[PDB]
Amino acid sequence: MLQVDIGSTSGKAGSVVSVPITFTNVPKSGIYALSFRTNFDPQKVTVASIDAGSLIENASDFTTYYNNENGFASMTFEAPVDRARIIDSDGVFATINFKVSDSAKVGELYNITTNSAYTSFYYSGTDEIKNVVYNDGKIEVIA
Amino acid sequence: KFIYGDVDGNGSVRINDAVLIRDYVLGKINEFPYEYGMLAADVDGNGSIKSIDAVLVRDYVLGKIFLFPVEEK
């Protein structure tokens, strides 16, 4: 079963930390389309940027957006209609770069969680990958 | 009953709805797997299904928009 991990990390107040989104046990038949949305508390962290990871062969297939008011970061992948590029192997899909609030306190732990309404994975235009398992992310504020 | 963007009729606007529209525009498929799919698919509200429809459904999924152009004013 496809495993989707929001990475965990640590950083100090005011720093930029990197949260990779990793796919493990990707089905050999491949992912034709997906969306992935993470929620966060914007009083604790904000999105600074999102980078394509190494699974993205062509940037035209990958789109991203974030909203630092309501607290989410979204990513989409859409394979070309001729299936010339498809995600069929394991790796980093994307990396979210989060800015840790200036008022963050040592020992706080912030949660980066998968939004199930806006997250889905497809073999094809009609067939969903149904047994994906997700692991959410932790950002630990350190000194 | 129907939801704008939901061309497969499962009740949710998702990335595969965008890709179905795109694959329809490109001639890869010839209809939607849903009796209200054509109605759901014309999200720019200009009377046909075109590449922009698929982009707008992707924008919904990304969270850039909540209302489709067909829904405003």
Ligand SMILES: [Ca+2]
């Ligand atoms: Ca995790």
Ligand SMILES: [Ca+2]
């Ligand atoms: Ca749908």
Ligand SMILES: [Ca+2]
């Ligand atoms: Ca249209």
